[PDB]
Amino acid sequence: GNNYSYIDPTQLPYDHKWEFPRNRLSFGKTLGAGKVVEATAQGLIKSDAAMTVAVKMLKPSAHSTEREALMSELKVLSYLGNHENIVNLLGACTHGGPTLVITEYCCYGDLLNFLRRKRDEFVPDFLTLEHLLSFSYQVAKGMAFLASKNCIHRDLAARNILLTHGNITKICDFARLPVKWMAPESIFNSVYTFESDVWSYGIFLWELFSLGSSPYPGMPVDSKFYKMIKEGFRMSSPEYAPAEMYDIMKTCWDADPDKRPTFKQIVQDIEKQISES
């Protein structure tokens, strides 16, 4: 009770093993916007070698609470540790300021823009169906890893999944809310859990197997949208979605969060699909 408590990663001190000289960073083009830029890190991993990285930083007009928020994200990434399917922390510039968060660089960018570019050149260097099951499998693995560290993402979507060399997908994270990806309990009661992440993973699967279509097409976010979602309206199967994968989406979209599968259940379900190829 009083003697045993969860260890809040945002309350732990910043570990200076991540500290990197900011004069060894040369910023390039902006990757996204709290902007993220491409940069060359001189001597980051090897002393005599430059390395392309991504650097997250706040807008110059960010105030006191925004500055501490970026530090908390840094501490969470440090507490999570390295994993194959997340955009891994590589270093930070914290002395003096402004805080710079150095992470892995993924040359292909976000998965949503990637799928829309490969939309034509798709057949079940060509995007295929084996890639789509691999992508769905790797994202569930990363989310299972997050769930194992008592961390929920709260903005899982194709736009927050990056692609790098070797077709490795990595989970990342770039008030206004992503309504069409949110579980009903998040929209109506503002609660976020492991299960609401699973709901968003189901929406991600629909983006993936439709080659990047916007979810709920032709439906604006309005009174009719909320009414239909609450009454049980769900999207139908995407054009390129296997039957066993659509069965997963339906379970992720269960109105009862306790009936939704866990990411640990999802990974081994997709494992049996890949195995029986």
Ligand X SMILES: Cn1cc(-c2ccc(CNc3cc(-c4cnc5cc(OCCCN6CCCC6)ccn45)ncn3)cc2)cn1
Q: How far is the CB of 68 from Cl ion (least distance, A)?
A: 21
Catalytic residue among 15, 48, 120, 155, which?
A: 155
Check binding of 162 to ligand X (CB under 6 A): yes
Rounded Cα distance, 151 and 40, in Å = 30
Check binding of 172 to ligand X (CB under 6 A): yes
Check binding of 194 to ligand X (CB under 6 A): no
Residues in the chain: 277
Which residues 134-173 are close enough to bind Cl ion by CB under 5 A?
Answer: 150
Residue (of 216, 239, 238, 237) closest to 228 by Cα position: 216
Residue of minimal Cβ distance to ligand X: 109
| DSSP codes, 102-113 | EE---TTEEHHH
Rounded Cα distance, 243 and 220, in Å = 28
Which residue number, 36 or 208, has a Cβ lying nearer to ligand X?
36
Stretch that binds ligand X, among 40-48, 99-107, 196-204, 235-243 (CB under 6 A): 99-107
CB 62 within 8 A of CB 71: no
| Cβ count near 187 (within 10 Å) | 18
Check binding of 92 to ligand X (CB under 6 A): no
Q: Is 247 a catalytic residue?
A: no
Residue (of 199, 205, 152) closest to 179 by Cα position: 199
Given Cl ion, ligand X, none, residue 36, with its beta carbon under 5 to 8 Å by kind, binds ligand X
The annotation places the binding site for Mg(2+) at 4, 160, 173
Residues that bind ligand X (CB under 6 A): 31-32, 36, 54, 56, 73, 77, 86-87, 101, 103, 105-106, 109, 146, 153, 162, 171-174
